[PDB]
């Protein structure tokens, strides 16, 4: 099988789940195996934020300090002086994977415990938010992990089904469509011209993730999660694994 070949080729473990929402055909490989979700959780966090707040309430200015800056703060490091609105924080979190922005958003929705509660409410019993900035340690722990199947199901719930009213659904989808961080991942494995909404993640042990909604020109979208990890803490990743895995998925569905 082509997925086993890629694990071999890239010295990594792959978790794959894809759902064609038109046919209900699926493509699965280790679909229920846990991986650190890393920044992919930002998408679900905004889904919860959008459930909590009116669109107008997203204009609430959030102030923060240099103390709130963490490992990677591409947008938030530029606005300590003014703060940023919740809307601008959601834009930073989703389109740049600004870690500080995610932290600020999580703080506003009541932290990981509160995020976990709201995910459970949409039917997600697997995803396990435990900490702000989900933190190295060891593989095996279920804290800050999910599965390809659960991330697909939760992303679909927010973005395409009924967990958000349509105007808020529109905001989430648009931010994800205009992601700047996933050019070499799922987007690189999809046919040209086909619109993609995605959120990437990356983490130690060579963890490299992308979750996405992919629209054919015409017809119902596919929802895909491609998760990966490696056995060494210091191992880096290769984006090409995710792109190639996506090509395998598209071939199996198309
Ligand atoms: C999201 O995944 C986030 N990742 C991290 O901050 C890291 N771990 O999170 C548990 C991390 C960065 S470097 C390292 N060894 N671990 C931000 N997301 C992306 C992304 O592409 O989405 C990054 C590339 C890094 S920073
Ligand atoms: C945002 C944050 O609090 C945080 C904390 C510890 C981290 C450790 C890392 N490695 C050991 C690689 C990487 C990112 C990290 C981010």
Curated annotation (Swiss-Prot):
Annotated membrane topology: Lipid-anchor
Source organism of this protein record: Bacillus licheniformis
Additional free-text comment from the UniProt record: The class A beta-lactamase family has a specific amino-acid numbering system, sometimes called Ambler or ABL numbering and often misspelt as Amber. A multiple sequence alignment was used to derive a consensus sequence and then the consensus was numbered taking into account insertions and deletions. This allows use of identical numbers, e.g. for active site residues, despite differences in protein length. UniProt always uses natural numbering of residues, hence there appear to be differences in numbering between this entry and some papers.
Keyword Hydrolase carried by entry: yes
Positions annotated to bind substrate: 199-201
Post-translational modification: Large exopenicillinase is the primary secretion product; it can be converted to small exopenicillinase.
Reactions it catalyzes: a beta-lactam + H2O = a substituted beta-amino acid
The protein's name: Beta-lactamase
Induction per the UniProt record: By the bacillus licheniformis protein BlaR1.
Span within the parent record: 48 to 303 of 307
Compartments reported by the entry: Cell membrane
GO biological process, one term: beta-lactam antibiotic catabolic process
Top-level taxon of origin: Bacteria
Family, similarity comment: Belongs to the class-A beta-lactamase family.
Main localization category: membrane
Active site, per annotation: 39 (acyl-ester intermediate)
An annotated Gene Ontology molecular function: beta-lactamase activity
E.C. no: 3.5.2.6
Keywords, sorted A to Z: Antibiotic resistance, Cell membrane, Hydrolase, Lipoprotein, Membrane, Palmitate, Signal
Record's keyword annotation contains Lipoprotein: yes
GO annotations of cellular component type: plasma membrane
């Amino acid at each position: 099988d082509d997925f086993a070949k890629l694990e071999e080729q890239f010295d990594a473990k792959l978790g794959i789940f894809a759902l064609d929402t038109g046919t209900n055909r699926t493509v699965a490989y280790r679909p229920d195996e846990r991986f650190a979700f890393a920044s992919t959780i930002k998408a679900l966090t905004v889904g919860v934020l959008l459930q909590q707040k009116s669109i107008e309430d997203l204009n609430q200015r959030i102030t923060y300090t240099r103390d709130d800056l963490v490992n990677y703060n591409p947008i938030t490091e530029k606005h300590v002086d003014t703060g940023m609105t919740l809307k601008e924080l959601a834009d930073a979190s989703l389109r740049y994977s600004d870690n500080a922005a995610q932290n600020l958003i999580l703080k506003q929705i009541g932290g990981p415990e509160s995020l976990k509660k709201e995910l459970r409410k949409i039917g997600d019993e697997v995803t396990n938010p435990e900490r702000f900035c989900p933190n190295e340690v060891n593989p095996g722990e279920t804290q800050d992990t999910s599965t390809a199947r659960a991330l697909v199901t939760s992303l679909r719930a927010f973005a395409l089904e009924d967990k958000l009213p349509s105007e808020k659904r529109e905001l989430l989808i648009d931010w994800m469509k205009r992601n700047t961080t996933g050019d070499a991942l799922i987007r690189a494995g999809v046919p040209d011209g086909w619109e993609v909404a995605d959120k990437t993640g990356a983490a130690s042990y060579g963890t490299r993730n992308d979750i996405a909604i992919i629209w054919p020109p015409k017809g119902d979208p596919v929802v895909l999660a491609v998760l990966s990890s490696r056995d060494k803490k210091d191992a880096k990743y290769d984006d090409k694994l995710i792109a190639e895995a996506t090509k395998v998925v598209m071939k199996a569905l198309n």
